[PDB]
Design a binder for this molecule. Structure first.
Ligand SMILES: O=[N+]([O-])c1ccc(/C=N/NC(=S)N[C@@H]2O[C@H](CO)[C@@H](O)[C@H](O)[C@H]2O)cc1
Ligand SMILES: O=[N+]([O-])c1ccc(/C=N/NC(=S)N[C@@H]2O[C@H](CO)[C@@H](O)[C@H](O)[C@H]2O)cc1
Ligand SMILES: O=[N+]([O-])c1ccc(/C=N/NC(=S)N[C@@H]2O[C@H](CO)[C@@H](O)[C@H](O)[C@H]2O)cc1
Ligand SMILES: O=[N+]([O-])c1ccc(/C=N/NC(=S)N[C@@H]2O[C@H](CO)[C@@H](O)[C@H](O)[C@H]2O)cc1
Lengths: 810, 810
């Protein structure tokens, strides 16, 4: 049907149809009479996956023959979403499969909806890893993602009585067609035990062993025939485990719990032993695999020439002392050489400055679980502090500030400090974030080793986040500038030549309208919720956090409602305000925010005076597959975190690429987005970082804002008095108390500017032609935010490897 | 190579080779450079399984169209062993696959060794179910085996320091190519809760729900294109289970533990809650599935015309009150009609008379776990006892004897009594066993309802137990009488015409010698144990139990050793005495018997005076795949249980079919084997049932035997004094004490006759020609013991269906 979706050749369609029928018969053991829609999905998945196999084998064979430097991306999170469409896109099979299924009497889009998200991540950090794997494959890098195969991913969110309920995400229930178990590469991981010192060095003994079984998932590049590997480890008990008899077998569950479930905290640290076990488990199994592959190329001098390890936050920080352990204890290298190799091998990416998100492991936990690693960490710390002492003689406070060991009630290891000491490069994820790292939380480290500190502004893959989720936009773009932009997103700049082109303006607006109609119908069918598709789609989707200020959005929503009630017969630009996102199950305030949103909807959506002019909808179960639907439908992207708190954001970039305008603070990547598009083409409001700092120095007094803004006072009084919870008048007391007395994120301080800026948004939306021209200006300058650019920078400036757009033979 | 293994057509071989290569590539994601022997096994398994699919679908479609009466065989055990060779045999693919793999440069026999046994059974009862499924398919019956998919089957046995160690049988680790998950037929099973009485009857409420997910395994008939189904249930938690958050997800293990592990007790009852849960789980899920299939044919009058349920022992006895529950509580049938349907539907097979093996569930367990079933059982008992009271007025002791409810310290439900009351047929598994049921333990029930009591002598499938494990014997037989005997084993009688045929005698003896050489080499390679292949192979393989009297075998072995030591330069017929079998992990005496056997070996096998004249080997990890190797190699089959204790035995029949002579008591099926072959062609010794009874009446005094048999006294003194355990002189005190003072199985009473009978065996073995002629007489009369005969009898006399040898179209 549409060009960017590839060719539907006679030969290809015929072949797909017969392979589809073969799988239905031989693989699913069904015929057309008993086959369910799920069977049809599986037959298609198997049919498509067959096309990956030859390329997957030949890519890995290529890397064996050429022996390039290998990149190991270590993450506890890979937020992959669905795989079927992505695979078809990258293999140019989409139109052929659409035709083949059509001729079999099936609707491919319906089949696509059956696939579970691989929800092995919480949010931005997890999805960043996924985008990165796609870009690394597209850029022909010999890259491997290593993580954990969680049996349960991020929980499915249900809204009951306006409250979040969690249910287990049993995503493997029907089997995963996109993985291959690799039991022959099963590796032992050690826990507990004790350290013995011999004549011939330290030895870690009396350990408990858990097996790490790998599962390989293919990562196809965009039409370059490259298929890289994501290897995820699953925990398995050894067969003599606990080996009255019955209980010993049942106790195997204890070992296997390691890979059972993803911890559902976004930007928050919980010092739980099971989490520590997961972190070591992925690190220990991965490093053995790396070394095995390296030996099958004795001399570890060349190790950093053949291996790069990227640490996605501090979660896999134990790679540093684990590499030291292997090199020193097992390979018998001297400390200084082992350390040189380690530093040259590892690089660390920081993803947050929020203090509650930083990993600080109690010493007593490491002592019990990983006694040898603790000793190695102490030694690293001693040698590191000796360097600090020589660089800054007499500066005793610097020594305690920089120590990997934090003194206090409970001694803790600062994992961030460990990562900086043991890495040749440390990067933040947006220019302002990286500057804040050098200026504030890692200032001491920057002063010691300035050369280590870099920026690598985040990006998103334009395969998933344009071609896949918004084929209509991808097509009208390709009609004008060709298809090359899909793997060279900077080419979108050519669209600036069409900003006055009446045909293009009409087409951009038409694609948006179609996306909105499609999403409005999705809402009715799957959720019985009715919306006006001619309204401005005002969307804030992201994890629920105080720093992300969903609460500020709520205050705007109530302001609009109160203004309508005040002057009912005055014209207002109609809005559909959509807010979605999961709250961490232990995060009370986030759960209260969700309840507030639904409570506001309950009042607003049933007020006859309001009509279809204002609707407030909570988007349930926000996840990658939902993002792919709502983002193309959005008009307005809410990116309203307090300046200095969102390290980068990536949702922001997704919206920019898909034709929504942005209202946001100068925070994270918003700054660079505004710089690329021009500040005139962005809705910027609120305190800058410096303004926040000034306010902190003076002391933030929320009462002052309450006293001086009558519209804000009204809202607080409505909240307190029970306007939004009539049968439970004090329901929102915690929220009011926080806003009034303990607001770390200064919701009130940005309120006036936010509302005024929102008025400017509504004014522009009244003029469809000028709204769309500004949209074109955003899409046209969104090129910098491709993860291909990001990965090319990692490759050149950190990993020391050149990307290649060259095809492997088919 | 050999005829019975089928044709190796040019077309077939070419096709197998390309499908093998296809699976290696697309299924295993390997090429020949990296492929391991396990990959090669899997490629072959997938290649062979492809041939089942069309027949499997068309068999089930056939049953839907024809709607025959369906047979449901309910068992907690299916001891299947390996599936690859069995499938090739039944599909006539063995020579084609052998040729295809040969041309690919692979040895098929080596690949076959890679497959794990499906070890979902303990011993005879579990393997009986497996033989039965094979026969039901071969006889064209619309039959389904229903059981539990245990994640862990019978433990792997390791011998360490002469002691049994258990390790988890993680048989699913590499995946099972012979199953298809059927998540669309997932069903809820209820536990706990409470009973509410309404105007509209009883209701079972507030239950905990566990999901039952079915996995289907094909059961091919012998060359008739019939493929039946074995459906095994796996336990799954519902997604809102326990739904702080992390623990709730980890707690899902509690629900799923139901299908985790097979209870490893052979002929012994342990009243554990988890076992009860397993029993109800299989019953509840199965009955819902049966009813669903029945409705997709309102009127339950026709239920018994369309459904037979066979209860394999009392393990699935809850089917009776579960059927009543569904019919009465859910379908709203009156009690009397529900009961009529239930009785006409269910039949019960008893597998033991040992009192410690009988299931007697504490009332307090049923009260908590299955409150509604307890009420139904009480009601069944009341109505049943009212019938007894009317039939035998005034006989109050009969009333308490026949009650389903046992009074005492803890009230218990006698599950055997439940099964008799609720079944239209009750059968024992060999003529003497069925007679003992009517005469002793179920005498009261027989007097009340004589028509219910039947015999169905056990059998074994000649596919696995001749063609598969002994192709050489199968071939020399087919050369003379054709191939028809494989599904009509009575035809073996034609071999009586060859008892004087010199060519046949030579061939029978040659096949045995080859089998012995092959097994002697298996022992050296896999276990570094060296044996004389010219010795008599004296084999006792079966679970370790006091009733099976491995101890009596031990006493014979020591007698032989002592006699050799006494007269070292006298000629004796050389023997290799092999004993193997697992002990239940909690059964102390059985574990001591294993230690004794290894301890005897340690002395005997290293005595220079003995030389190669006597060797004692403990066969480690006895299981179906090992049986297939050792049974064809055996000369002498030890079947030496105390008369009246082995209900049937089936190992006995396996040996008879494979050319071993039998030394045994007149117990279980041995009686019918001797009757078929002629008592002159059997080595019968020892007390009959009546002699045991006489001895019990008088009182068994072991001391009397010790006092009068000097050779027996010597052995006991050697055991006591530490002759067989020099560094632990009292190691075997428990064994001596048991033999001397508390021997329920009268080991000493059969000792003299046993030893004398063993002398007669040795005498015959000295004359190879006459040994072999007697062997031919055994093989020739082994036809009765085909499970095809057994199943044809069940079909005609219990299930009310006619077997059919007619082919379905290919
Ligand atoms: O994505 N690709 O390109 C891909 C992935 C896998 C294969 C081959 N796969 N081959 C096997 S046998 N896959 C198995 O399938 C089971 C579910 O059916 C899984 O539970 C199991 O973990 C997995 O190993 C081939 C291609
Ligand atoms: O379960 N635990 O214990 C856990 C889980 C996750 C975290 C941290 N999660 N951290 C995230 S998701 N960080 C995000 O990273 C994105 C990509 O750079 C940025 O765009 C974004 O600004 C930033 O907030 C911390 C602890
Ligand atoms: O024996 N036959 O005839 C047979 C059995 C199965 C199939 C088709 N099978 N098709 C699938 S997708 N099999 C899956 O495979 C996984 C391991 O790879 C298992 O873990 C999983 O339980 C199983 O359902 C086809 C034929
Ligand atoms: O784990 N639990 O709780 C358990 C397991 C098994 C049993 C009983 N297992 N019972 C057996 S294996 N019975 C056997 O049946 C064979 C077939 O008829 C006969 O040939 C043989 O004579 C007879 O002993 C009892 C309890």
């Amino acid at each position: 049907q549409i060009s960017v979706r590839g060719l539907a050749g006679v030969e290809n369609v015929t072949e797909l149809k017969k392979n589809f029928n073969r799988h239905l018969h031989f693989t699913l053991v069904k015929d057309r009479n008993v086959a369910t829609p799920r069977d049809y999905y599986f037959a298609l998945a198997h049919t498509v996956r067959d096309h990956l196999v030859g390329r997957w084998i030949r890519t890995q064979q290529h890397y064996y023959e050429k022996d390039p430097k290998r990149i190991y991306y270590l993450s506890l999170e890979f937020y992959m979403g669905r795989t079927l469409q992505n695979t078809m896109v990258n293999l140019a099979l989409e139109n052929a499969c659409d035709e083949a299924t059509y001729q079999l009497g099936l609707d491919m889009e319906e089949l696509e909806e059956i696939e579970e998200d691989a929800g092995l991540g919480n949010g931005g950090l997890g999805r960043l890893a996924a985008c990165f794997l796609d870009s690394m494959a597209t850029l022909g890098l010999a890259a491997y993602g290593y993580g954990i195969r969680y049996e349960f991913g991020i929980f499915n969110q249900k809204i009951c009585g306006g409250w979040q309920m969690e249910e287990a995400d049993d995503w493997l229930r029907y089997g995963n067609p996109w993985e291959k178990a690799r039991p022959e590469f099963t590796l032992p991981v050690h826990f507990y035990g004790r350290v013995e010192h011999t004549s011939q060095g330290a030895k870690w003994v009396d350990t408990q062993v858990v097996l790490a079984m790998p599962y390989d998932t293919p990562v196809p590049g965009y039409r370059n025939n490259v298929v890289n590997t994501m290897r995820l480890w699953s925990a398995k008990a050894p067969n003599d485990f606990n080996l009255g008899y019955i209980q010993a077998v049942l106790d195997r569950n204890l070992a296997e719990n390691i890979s059972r479930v993803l911890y559902p905290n976004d930007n928050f640290f919980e010092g739980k032993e099971l989490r520590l076990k997961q972190e070591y488990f992925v690190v220990a199994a991965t490093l053995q695999d790396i070394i095995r592959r390296f030996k099958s190329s004795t001399n570890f001098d060349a190790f950093p020439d053949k291996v790069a390890i990227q640490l996605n936050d501090t979660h896999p920080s134990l790679a540093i002392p684990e590499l030291m352990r292997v090199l020193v204890d097992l390979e018998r290298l001297d400390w200084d050489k082992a350390w040189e190799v380690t530093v040259k091998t590892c690089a660390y990416t920081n993803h947050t400055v929020l203090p509650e998100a930083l990993e600080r492991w109690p010493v007593h936990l490491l002592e019990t679980l990983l006694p040898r690693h603790l000793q190695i960490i102490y030694e690293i710390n001693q040698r590191f502090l000796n360097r600090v002492a020589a660089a800054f003689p007499g500066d005793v406070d610097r020594l305690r500030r920089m120590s990997l060991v934090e003194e206090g009630a409970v001694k803790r290891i600062n994992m961030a400090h460990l990562c900086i000491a043991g890495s040749h490069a440390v990067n933040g994820v947006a220019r302002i974030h990286s500057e804040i790292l050098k200026k504030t939380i890692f200032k001491d480290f920057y002063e010691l080793e300035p050369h280590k500190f870099q920026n690598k502004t985040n990006g998103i893959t334009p395969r998933r986040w344009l071609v896949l989720c918004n084929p209509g936009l991808a097509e009208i773009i390709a009609e004008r500038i060709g298809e090359e932009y899909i793997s060279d997103l900077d080419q979108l700049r050519k669209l600036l030549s069409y900003v006055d082109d009446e045909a293009f303006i009409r087409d951009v607006a038409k694609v948006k309208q179609e996306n909105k109609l499609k999403f409005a119908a999705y809402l009715e069918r799957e959720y019985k919720v009715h919306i006006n598709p001619n309204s401005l789609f005002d969307v804030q989707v992201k994890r629920i956090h105080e720093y992300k200020r969903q609460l500020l959005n709520c205050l705007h929503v109530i302001t609009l409602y109160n203004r309508i009630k005040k002057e009912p017969n005055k014209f207002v630009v109609p809005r559909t305000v959509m807010i979605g996102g999961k709250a961490a199950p232990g995060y009370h305030m986030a759960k209260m925010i969700i309840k507030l949103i639904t409570a506001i909807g309950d009042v607003v959506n049933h007020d006859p005076v309001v009509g279809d002019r204002l609707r407030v909808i909570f988007l349930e179960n926000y996840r990658v597959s939902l993002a792919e639907k709502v983002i193309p439908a959005a008009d307005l992207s809410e990116q309203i975190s307090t300046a200095g708190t969102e390290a980068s954001g990536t949702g922001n970039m997704k919206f920019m690429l898909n034709g929504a305008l942005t209202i946001g603070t100068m925070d994270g990547a918003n700054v660079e987005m505004a710089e690329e598009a021009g500040e005139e083409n962005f809705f910027i409001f609120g305190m800058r970082v410096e303004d926040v700092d000034r306010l902190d120095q003076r002391g933030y007094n929320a009462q002052e804002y309450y006293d001086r803004i009558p519209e804000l006072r009204q809202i607080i009084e409505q909240l307190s008095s029970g306007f939004f919870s009539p049968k439970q008048p004090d329901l929102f007391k915690d929220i009011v108390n926080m806003l009034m007395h303990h607001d770390r994120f200064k919701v009130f301080a940005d309120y006036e500017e936010y509302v005024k800026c929102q008025e400017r948004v509504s004014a522009l939306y009244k003029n469809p032609r000028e709204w769309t021209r500004m949209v074109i200006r955003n899409i046209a300058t969104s090129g910098k935010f491709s993860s291909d650019r990001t990965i090319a920078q990692y490759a050149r400036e950190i990993w020391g490897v050149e990307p290649s757009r060259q095809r492997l033979p088919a």
